Design a binder for these strands. Structure first.
Ligand SMILES: [K+]
Ligand SMILES: [K+]
Ligand SMILES: [K+]
Ligand SMILES: [Mg+2]
Ligand SMILES: [Mg+2]
Ligand SMILES: [Mg+2]
Ligand SMILES: [Mg+2]
Ligand SMILES: [Mg+2]
Ligand SMILES: [Mg+2]
Ligand SMILES: [Mg+2]
Ligand SMILES: [Mg+2]
Ligand SMILES: [Mg+2]
Lengths: 102, 291, 120, 25
RNA sequence: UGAUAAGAUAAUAAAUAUGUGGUGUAAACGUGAGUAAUUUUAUUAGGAAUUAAUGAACUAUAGAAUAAGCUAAAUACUUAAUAUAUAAAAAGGAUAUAUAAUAUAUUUAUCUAUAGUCAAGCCAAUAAUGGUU
RNA sequence: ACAUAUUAUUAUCUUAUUAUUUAUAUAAUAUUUUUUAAUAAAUUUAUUAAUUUAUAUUUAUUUAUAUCAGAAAU
């Protein structure tokens, strides 16, 4: 669509890549701190630039959020419980309660 | 062994009892269930040995905390640590939140200033925890005869010992102190005298809402000389002896009031045989100032 | 979508050529299990328009067959449409803007053609 | 035993009916 | 706020799902061992006992949401209060505004009742491989 | 013949667990109930630990019946 305007929290692409997170700060060299490139490159261009599937989809989702004045704060992917996934929690917990508290 | 050590053990046993779980209380404190406890083999928290029977706990004496207060070393955090643990209990434990009396807070504030030398951190634990007392249905502890007067008295000594003369800090602190009072029942009338003395000392005109004028009504201990009845009566009126002696010594304007001197005569002559409370306190303030 | 009775798409056709049944189904049954009722069909691939037609102004058409009366009954008894089915019903004029969401709310987008009910 | 008392009760009932058939026939 | 800084309170911005809680796994997926039918399959414009104070979870409407205890605390749990012979309940949170914790407003949840929708239990009739060595 | 494996059955033996049903406790908890100390507050009351009292809910043991399974026989 159109190119949104830089804000004070997100002055440049590098700040944009740091707020969204998910290790997207490792693509700062792909974009070259060019504001227009971040808001013009679609999936096909990003795929040609070596951005992997998960990251390019995530960036495009946050680019759409920014264009619509919606928060771009990092949301973390889910993680299994400390005691393991539900299917292996009973076994893990039994072996963790006999090696920590006896 | 010492009076302080024994009092602390009694106070720590009382808290452990009321912090124990209700389901487990009958099996850990009723000696008839000692064998039922063993069989259950409940595991003491902290992964320690299974819980063992304890001697039944009975209501604690209010004098127990007065003994601990006056045992704390000259520069120690023991009183500040006990209070923080005692007032961290749930507000559902009525025995814990009703043991504290107006006398205890007066003795915690007078000991901290003249003996333990950590007044600032004792007036912050009391100011910080006042909200919990209200939720725990014990607001009376924050009154005018034990909390406000004792505070203004310690202020009339720190402002001198330290020479503080700012007329803005003093008024702000005086306003906060009055705002912290939840049981505003002026009886002795010494509060008005104490507030006026502060203003003269720090050169400001006090003005607090609700502190209506009260004539002096100092309790006169009778000439009769009993034993534990007059030792308790003196200890009961010990706080107002520290306030009468303070008022006269700080400012000579209070010498005008002759009611103050009658109580000094009565309280001093009541047990003049023993040492002086006022002087004993001031000596320690110097023994703490030197450090 | 919530509830026990949902209006959703069941997939038919072949690999790489999906077609869908619009069905009323129990939430817990398999997507392609025999539903309560088959309300219609959805062909997601638009009909291709020729070069001339494109310049002529023809827009590709996606074709939906639907029992309008029966669909309204199931909405009446509290059946809950899926997001994709919701979009279809709003375009058909059965559902209104009350079923729109914040992400798809076309509050400000120009209308080039207004919904037209005809006979054919 | 409870199972030996149930067995005998049923065995007597079956034998009374087998005799009943002979008396009816 | 605390006369010296340990703490407390509020606002704001984050962190924590190795603590207590909620919902989710009777489905779907896979398989064909058992099963020859008091049980399983199929069928019928079949039936009654003439099927619960059951809603499972959405829809429509109406009303309600109280007091203690227990836990560190709660939308946890327990005991009570009041609600269609009568019986049988519940829960707050978020955000604003005004007050001196309370009240409204918005938003999302809780409970009950009535009907709908989805969905259950039971029975009959008829049919369902080989051997009477 | 028979040595094996599998399954079923029982007027038999042993039996986990569970359900149901007995008897018992100076059994535990709550409330009630009879008193009794200790402690506390106030100047009788409360609390805790005991005892008496019934009540409900549990627990331990115990009686009987049924029961996974195994044994023996067929
Ligand atoms: K498979
Ligand atoms: K099979
Ligand atoms: K609300
Ligand atoms: Mg939802
Ligand atoms: Mg958890
Ligand atoms: Mg299943
Ligand atoms: Mg309520
Ligand atoms: Mg509560
Ligand atoms: Mg609940
Ligand atoms: Mg209830
Ligand atoms: Mg033959
Ligand atoms: Mg058997």
């Amino acid at each position: 669509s159109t190119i949104p305007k830089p804000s004070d929290q997100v002055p440049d692409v590098d700040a944009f890549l740091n707020k969204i997170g998910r290790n997207c700060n490792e693509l700062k060299d792909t974009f070259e701190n060019n504001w227009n490139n971040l808001f013009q490159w679609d999936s096909k261009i990003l795929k040609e630039k070596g951005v992997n599937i998960q990251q390019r989809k995530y960036i495009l989702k946050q680019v759409h959020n920014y264009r619509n004045n919606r928060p771009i704060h990092e949301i973390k992917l889910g993680k299994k419980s400390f005691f393991g996934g539900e299917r292996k929690r009973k076994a893990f917990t039994a072996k963790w309660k006999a090696e920590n508290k006896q | 062994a010492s009076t302080g050590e024994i009092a602390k053990a009694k106070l720590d046993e009382f808290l452990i009892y009321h912090k124990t779980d209700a389901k487990l209380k009958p099996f850990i404190y009723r000696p008839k269930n000692a064998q039922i406890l063993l069989t259950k083999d409940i595991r003491d928290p902290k992964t320690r040995e299974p819980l063992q029977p304890r001697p039944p706990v009975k209501p604690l004496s209010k004098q127990t905390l007065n003994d601990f207060i006056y045992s704390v070393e000259p520069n120690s955090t023991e009183l500040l640590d006990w209070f923080k643990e005692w007032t961290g209990t749930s507000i559902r434990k009525r025995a814990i939140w009703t043991y504290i009396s107006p006398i205890h807070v007066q003795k915690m504030l007078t000991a901290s200033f003249f003996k333990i030398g950590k007044y600032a951190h004792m007036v912050g634990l009391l100011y910080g925890i006042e909200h919990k007392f209200l939720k725990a249905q014990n607001p009376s502890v924050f009154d005018i005869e034990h909390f406000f007067n004792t505070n203004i008295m310690c202020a009339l000594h720190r402002n001198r010992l330290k020479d503080y003369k700012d007329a803005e800090i003093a008024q702000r602190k005086l306003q906060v102190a009055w705002k912290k009072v939840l049981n505003r029942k002026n009886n002795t009338g010494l509060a008005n005298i104490l507030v006026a003395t502060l203003g003269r000392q720090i050169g400001f005109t006090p003005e607090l809402t609700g502190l209506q004028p009260v004539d002096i009504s100092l309790p006169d201990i009778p000439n009769s000389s009993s034993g534990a009845e007059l030792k308790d009566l003196l200890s009961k009126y010990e706080g107002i002896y520290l306030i009468a002696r303070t008022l006269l010594d700080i400012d000579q304007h209070n010498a005008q009031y002759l009611e103050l001197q009658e109580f000094i005569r009565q309280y001093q002559n009541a047990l003049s045989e023993s040492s002086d409370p006022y002087d004993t306190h001031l000596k320690a303030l110097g023994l703490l100032e030197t450090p | 979508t919530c509830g026990l009775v949902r209006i959703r798409l069941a997939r038919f056709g072949r690999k790489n050529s999906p077609v869908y049944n619009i069905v009323v189904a129990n939430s817990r049954k398999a997507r392609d299990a025999k539903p309560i009722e088959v309300l219609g069909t959805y062909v997601p691939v638009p009909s291709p328009v020729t070069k001339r037609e494109l310049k002529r102004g023809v827009v590709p058409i996606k074709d939906v067959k639907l029992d309008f009366d029966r669909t309204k009954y199931w909405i009446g008894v509290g059946a809950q449409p899926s997001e994709t089915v919701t979009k279809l019903l709003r375009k058909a004029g059965i559902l209104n803007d009350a079923w729109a969401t914040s992400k798809n709310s076309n509050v400000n987008r120009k209308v080039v053609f207004e919904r037209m009910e005809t006979l054919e | 035993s409870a199972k030996a008392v149930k067995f005998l009760k049923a065995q007597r009932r079956k034998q009374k009916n087998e005799a009943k058939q002979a008396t009816l026939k």
